[PDB]
From a paper:
The X-ray determined structure of MamM-CTD V260R contained two tightly packed monomers in the asymmetric unit. Overlapping the monomers of wild-type MamM-CTD and the V260R mutant demonstrated that both share a similar fold, with a Cα-RMSD of 0.43 Å. While the wild-type MamM-CTD structure contains a disordered C-terminal tail (residues 293-318), a rigid conformation was adopted by residues 294-302 in a single V260R monomer comprising the dimer. This rigid C-terminal extension gave rise to the formation of a fourth β-sheet aligned in parallel to the three existing β-sheets located in the inner metal-binding interface of the dimer. The V260R dimer presented a tighter and twisted conformation in reference to wild-type MamM-CTD dimeric structure. As such, the V260R dimer structure presents a dramatic increase in the dimerization interface surface (377 Å2), in reference to the dimerization interface surface of the wild-type (193 Å2). According to the V260R determined structure, the altered dimerization interface is stabilized asymmetrically by several salt bridges, polar and hydrophobic interactions located at the top and bottom of the dimer. The twisted dimeric fold of V260R allows the formation of the central putative binding site but prevents the formation of the wild-type His264-Glu289 double peripheral binding sites. However, by examining the V260R dimer, we could predict two alternative peripheral symmetrical binding sites between Glu268-His264, each from a different monomer. Although the V260R mutant dimer was able to bind the same number of zinc cations as the wild-type dimer in vitro, it was not functional in vivo.
Author numbering:
A (entry chain B): 211 to 302
B (entry chain A): 211 to 291
Amino acid sequence: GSHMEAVQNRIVEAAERVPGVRGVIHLRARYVGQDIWADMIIGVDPENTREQAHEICEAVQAAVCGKIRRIESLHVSAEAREIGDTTKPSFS
Amino acid sequence: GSHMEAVQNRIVEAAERVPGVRGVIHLRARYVGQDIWADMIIGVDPENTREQAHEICEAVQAAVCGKIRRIESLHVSAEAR
């Protein structure tokens, strides 16, 4: 595809469909054999309270883990973006 | 004992000292290249709101990450118990 890339993009689209998500900021995905362990940073509206931001992260974790075959583990955290800015997901 | 056994005890000791934590229910840690990735479940008092339970989880993450350099990613969730 490359393959990790096709899977990275599927993780991103699954997250980006969760209500409250304003973009995937960063995805780090590591291949343990066939399995994937991931750590994702999502953007959320700066209007959100901390409580609200936490629930968006929990919903992303459930949604991505439910949809993406061989996600062994996923951690999601949140950053308050934007007033505008701006950016396409990055990957490592 | 082994490196991973020693790492798992430090994680559990670090977590159990965070205010709000009522025991470590479950811990999985694994090596991935040069790094350690882990996932953990803490016990929290049932009286805690969900908001409160999330803030305990975050505090564990910061504490354990701060104390154990080689951990690249740690996920913490909570069960009321």
